[PDB]
């Protein structure tokens, strides 16, 4: 394995990456802003480096600071997580120019898929259906490619519950998607990976309407909702990224990828339910939910202050069951068990969505939540 990596991110995803590193025996370097010294993953990391003041512009987006931290600590690779610099092709290029492994695709591939014009042309050439949409669902295909010619798909996710184009609930697999539709669109995505020389984890986002898929964009990084795919396949997507990055060919064949059960993820945000405006502050009492099929992904703890400088998402609750109904029933109970006092959160909204008759039936479109609210 990689001897030592910099986790070039923060919050829940940084903690997610740290855990995978610990499991693989990879040493961790937590780079953090002045406002993030008390992040759980920072406290758990082997080494820590303060890379700048609070604003992201001068810390988590500060390319020379992050490279310098990686050099001084003797790291060999950098994991960008999601957001921040994960899809910054200039960053990928510099990481590799500086002699590090970038845990993600080649810079050229980031540029190719980061421009909508070049992206669509690449997809059309590959055989991925593009827009040639009033009532669509958001359905996305998870892929893994080793950058060595091997590429697999790991079913799909439905992320149609959104507010202002930001996902609120994600689930896997997508309700209504048959093994044959899954195979059709998955094979096309896997081929596209080979054709573009894709390396690492990635997501093909589609609009899905009247039984047809239409490509919107590729996220050339890990996804916020990766855990739902993990629950239904058993594949640890972060460990796979780390293995691929170490130069290991894919250790999973397509025929070894099986969908079993169902998982739902509720994003937990520090926000005023009356306005949906961020509500940072100090958490005074905290209790995580437990139980069979319950997975809580979050850096928060009792006494932790959510700073004002970053995104409002503070955690993700993921519930798995043998079927969709069990997953939803467990989510209902887990959301009720969750205690986050001292700040405002969207837990009550998540409870309402779980209790929604149309969501319980499934297959609601991308416009549903905003119509409901």
Curated annotation (Swiss-Prot):
Species in which this protein is naturally found: Escherichia coli (strain K12)
Binding-site list for biotin: 267
E.C. no? 6.3.4.14
**Protein name, UniProt field:** Biotin carboxylase
**Enzyme active site:** 221
- List residues of the Biotin carboxylation domain: 1-373
Domain of life of the organism encoding this protein:
Bacteria
Annotated Mn(2+) 1 binding lies at 205, 217
